[PDB]
């Protein structure tokens, strides 16, 4: 019954909420600024129930899937014209409802509502307090793109461009290289060792845990499995709507690619700005900002890096006692220490296996197992036994 109402709205070329702000419907970028249902769930509490995008690549991908499904949304539109003219031709309400019924059947509009299936009482509580079947079928709003998604091929191509992919590889390489540097430094100042020893110190106080007289039963009860042993989640005080919405929309806002971010900001600012411009000078403006943006942020990163590892030099270049003069502070990162450390690892080292003339350094599994795999056969074997949950030989 509700499905025919939804289809009824997908047929009209007008927005079903009429562009009006509804606290319960997030108009999502990822979805193409479309009115998705996003209620606040108080069973969880304080939380808007809806996907939070954690990476830019998800954004790019969703946009790309829209561009991909363009063709289908279009065939759908020329189909919809036919449909609503065929609706104009119908003089009665019951026959119209029959048409919407059979057609909402056909476009699988009903399949767009995703209901939680969990037979577990607690999961049932989470979903069904705020968000239920009776509720979800009632509040559901279908955009054309979610309908087209069901009948269509699956794109094997993410919207990530050649150059965006270059940017990816370099971002990853940079970050990882910096984290390994950081860790090797934590090992050099010996804070790792101090951490271990301090753990040893803390052990002095603790008791041995009470594991129960019947240990199966105890373990199980602790996990909440047995009958009547189920505990409800601690009740969470709901957080202000402004905070929840800042969480949700702050998520998507962080993920927005450069081009779109700059562009949106530029037009929406161009309405209220002092000396507006249309045509090319607008475009130009954008580009320069974009072209500055990169350089700006890029520059910044380096400075930050030099603060983290203490890169650069301490005094003026020409000091009386030489350029080399430097001071090391107890547990502080300094360029001298980074390059010294790196030197220590590999000095004249030609290859990673240089020392593997020594059988005892050879089979050390510390760095990984990769150098002790020689023939295909052993690698298949290793694969096999890792899949069977056994130990690797």
């Amino acid at each position: 019954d509700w499905a025919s109402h939804m289809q009824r709205e997908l047929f009209g070329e007008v927005d079903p909420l009429g562009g009006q702000a509804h606290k319960d419907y997030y108009r999502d970028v990822t979805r193409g600024y479309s009115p998705q249902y996003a209620p606040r769930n108080f069973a969880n509490g304080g939380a808007v129930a809806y996907p939070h995008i954690q990476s830019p690549y998800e954004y790019e991908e969703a946009a790309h899937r829209r561009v991909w499904l363009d063709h289908d949304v279009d065939r759908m539109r020329e189909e919809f014209t036919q449909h609503r003219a065929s609706l104009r031709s119908l003089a009665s309400a019951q026959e119209r409802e029959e048409l919407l019924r059979s057609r909402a059947a056909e476009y699988q509009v009903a399949n767009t509502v995703h209901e939680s299936e969990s037979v577990h009482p607690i999961q049932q509580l989470y979903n069904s307090g705020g968000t239920s079947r009776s509720a979800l079928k009632q509040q559901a709003v279908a955009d054309r793109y979610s309908i087209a998604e069901q009948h269509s091929p699956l794109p094997l191509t993410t919207g990530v461009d050649r150059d965006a992919l270059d940017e990816a590889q370099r971002t990853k390489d940079r970050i990882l290289n910096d984290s390994f540097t950081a860790e090797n430094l934590l090992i050099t100042h010996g804070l790792r060792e101090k951490e271990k020893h301090d753990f040893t110190i803390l052990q002095r106080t603790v008791r041995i845990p009470f594991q129960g007289y019947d240990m199966d039963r105890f373990l199980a009860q602790q996990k909440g499995t047995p009958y009547g042993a189920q505990q409800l989640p601690p009740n969470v005080v709901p957080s202000s709507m402004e905070e929840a919405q800042r969480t949700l929309r702050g998520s998507s806002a962080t993920a927005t690619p450069l081009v779109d971010a700059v562009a949106q900001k530029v037009y929406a600012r161009n309405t209220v700005v002092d000396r507006p411009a249309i045509g090319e000078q607008l475009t130009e403006q954008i580009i320069n900002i974009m072209r500055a943006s990169r350089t700006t942020a890029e520059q910044q990163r380096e400075e930050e890096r030099a603060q983290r590892f203490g890169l650069g030099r301490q005094g003026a270049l020409v000091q009386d006692g030489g350029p080399d003069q430097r001071t090391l502070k107890k547990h502080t990162n300094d360029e001298r220490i980074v390059d010294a450390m790196l030197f220590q690892q590999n000095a004249y080292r030609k290859t990673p296996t240089d020392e593997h003339w020594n059988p005892y350094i050879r089979r050390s599994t510390e760095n990984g197992v990769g150098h002790l795999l020689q023939n295909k056969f052993d690698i298949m074997r290793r694969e096999d036994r890792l899949s069977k949950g056994e130990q690797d030989l």
Partner: protein, 590 residues
């Protein structure tokens, strides 16, 4: 590219200014804005201010660019130099810039047109004084006709508009006066007949007058609400208004006075059927009425939220609030659990009902404040934006999809324009001389031949012998039978999901928080696919010897290695590292 509360150009200024035409005075500009062809677009003072300033600035730009190109007979980025003209690369870059800028302009303008016919507040009045039957019929069949699901609804819209007009006459601006020519010109059907099939009855119109008077209808908007809610069983209920509606006595009285004082010039039941819709547009006799209808849509639209006047209808017109409730939880849960599981122990049943009441309280308590703070947060691009988010209700509001397709085309044009920058301008020579000091070395300085890419993984997960077999031979053929197509679809769907998961893990691999969550998407995907593979494998082997056939050729492939337990790193290849370390890297979030 468009946002809430943004102006777009609907005028083409560039075509005239390239020919050498320009303006100086305000009056010249006002002479520039006005449309000869029939239609008349009114404006706000604000939009005119902005458009004039933009115009002036375009003057300064085309001027300083034409002057710049006359002196050399745009300005390079800070570290770049201009390639010579008549160089292949420069001509390429300039062609790209030309095309892209063209497309950008076409998009800004088309989005402006969308704004215009969406009846956004900075385009207050679209006047029709100059049109003839061709223009009125085209306008109707593009704007009104094509959008409407209900044909009968159109006549109602027209009549309600006519009653609103005829009743609200004093408060209208002078610019509207012409339309009354049509109002009194309206042709009506003889009271029960050649016009029986052509025109509606007067009685219906007076019913609509009754609606206007009892409900105080000031708008196309409130007219939309009222026209959607009036034919339904809950009518007095739905349309009940914040100022309470008048009693039918006085209303039917002023309707008798109006009707009768209108006879001398020459609880009412909802009216009967109307003539088939086509009549309205294709008959001369109804041309005035038609006119009214158009003047009905493109004007008479004002901001105000109709649900301040009709708070009871907010649930019917647009979705109701989720926080507003229109048995006990334990019983719903017992029903979804079925009879195959033990009934809930009643400790837990009690506690769950307790939670249901507590959450009920939280909902009732936060209902109003959430609304308030949400609008207050929307008043404040920024995290909160849209094509249409506005506080006010617009019945003509445009589909998100039409705007988004424009925006997408626009960003395409934008990357295209930014692409040309490195064709037109070039780095310093000796800088690329020093750039060729360090060669690109196959092994190190080059990026590895395996990047994260979707088809990379889709080829990895299809490379498995069991999956390859299941794909090609194992499943019943995809074209032959229905089970074939079903199976095939699902297997490719699951392979796809798993691939996507692997991919999204591979991009974000460097940061912990994200990788754990992605890795859980993986675990789910793999579990799905593995269950499918195992199931269909069992099907193959059980189904009902002869050399090299299906079942033998299956058994030759050995034991199936699950993708669940598979340890796959950043690059989609089995890991170098020891099992414990990998286990630790991919360990779930907390």
């Amino acid at each position: 590219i468009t946002s809430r509360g943004q102006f777009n150009p609907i005028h083409n200024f560039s075509y005239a200014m390239e020919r050498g035409v320009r303006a100086r005075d305000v009056k010249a500009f006002e002479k520039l804005i006005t449309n000869p062809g029939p239609l008349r677009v009114a404006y706000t003072p604000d939009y005119l201010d902005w458009l004039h300033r933009c115009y002036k600035a375009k003057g300064t730009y085309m001027d300083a660019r034409a002057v710049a190109e006359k002196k050399f007979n745009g300005a390079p980025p800070p570290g770049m130099f201009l390639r010579p003209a008549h160089s292949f690369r420069r001509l390429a870059g300039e062609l790209k810039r030309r095309r892209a800028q063209s497309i950008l302009d076409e998009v800004a303008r088309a989005q402006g047109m969308l704004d215009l016919f969406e009846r956004q507040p900075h385009f207050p009045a679209i006047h029709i004084d100059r049109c003839s039957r061709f223009h009125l019929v085209e306008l109707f069949k593009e704007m009104v006709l094509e959008r409407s699901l209900d044909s009968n609804m159109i006549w109602e819209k027209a009549l309600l508009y006519r009653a609103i007009l005829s009743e609200r006459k004093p408060s209208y601006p002078t610019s509207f006066h012409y339309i009354f020519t049509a109002v009194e010109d309206t042709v009506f059907a003889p009271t029960i007949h050649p016009l029986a099939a052509k025109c509606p009855t007067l009685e219906a119109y007076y019913y609509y007058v009754y609606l206007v008077k009892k409900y105080y209808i000031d708008n196309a908007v409130e007219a939309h609400v009222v026209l959607r809610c009036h034919r339904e069983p809950n009518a007095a209920d739905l349309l009940f208004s914040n100022p309470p509606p008048k009693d039918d006595t006085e209303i039917m009285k002023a309707v008798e006075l109006l009707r009768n004082a209108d006879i001398q010039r020459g609880p009412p039941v909802l009216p009967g059927a109307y003539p088939p819709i086509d009549m309205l547009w294709r008959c001369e006799e109804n041309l005035p009425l038609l006119k009214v209808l158009l003047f009905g849509e493109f004007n008479l639209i004002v901001s105000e939220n109709p649900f301040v006047k009709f708070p009871s209808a907010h649930g019917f017109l647009t979705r109701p609030y989720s926080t507003d409730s229109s048995m006990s939880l334990a019983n719903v849960m017992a029903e979804k659990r079925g009879h195959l599981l033990p009934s809930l122990p009643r400790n837990t049943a009690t506690s769950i009902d307790a939670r249901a009441q507590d959450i009920r309280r939280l909902q009732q308590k936060h209902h109003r404040d959430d609304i308030v703070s949400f609008q207050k947060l929307l008043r404040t691009p920024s995290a909160f934006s849209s094509y249409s988010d506005w506080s006010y209700f617009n019945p003509r509001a445009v589909r998100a999809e039409e705007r988004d397709r424009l925006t997408r085309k626009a960003v395409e044009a934008l990357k295209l324009y930014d692409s040309a920058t490195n064709d037109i301008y070039r780095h310093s020579f000796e800088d690329v001389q020093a750039c060729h000091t360090q060669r690109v070395t196959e092994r190190d300085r080059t990026m590895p031949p395996y990047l994260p890419t979707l088809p990379h993984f889709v080829a990895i997960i299809k490379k498995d012998p069991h999956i390859s077999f299941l794909l090609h031979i194992g499943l019943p053929d995809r074209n032959s039978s229905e089970e074939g197509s079903a199976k095939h679809k699902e297997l490719e769907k699951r392979i796809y999901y798993l691939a996507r998961a692997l991919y999204h893990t591979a991009l974000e691999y460097h940061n912990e928080t994200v990788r754990r969550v992605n890795r859980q998407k993986v675990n789910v995907a793999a579990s799905l696919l593995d269950n499918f593979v195992e199931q269909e494998w069992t099907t193959i082997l059980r189904d009902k010897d002869t050399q090299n056939d299906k079942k033998q050729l299956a058994r030759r492939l050995g034991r199936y290695m699950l993708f669940a337990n598979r340890s796959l790193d950043d690059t989609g290849f089995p890991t170098d590292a020891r099992a414990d370390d990998y286990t630790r890297w991919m360990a779930p979030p907390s």
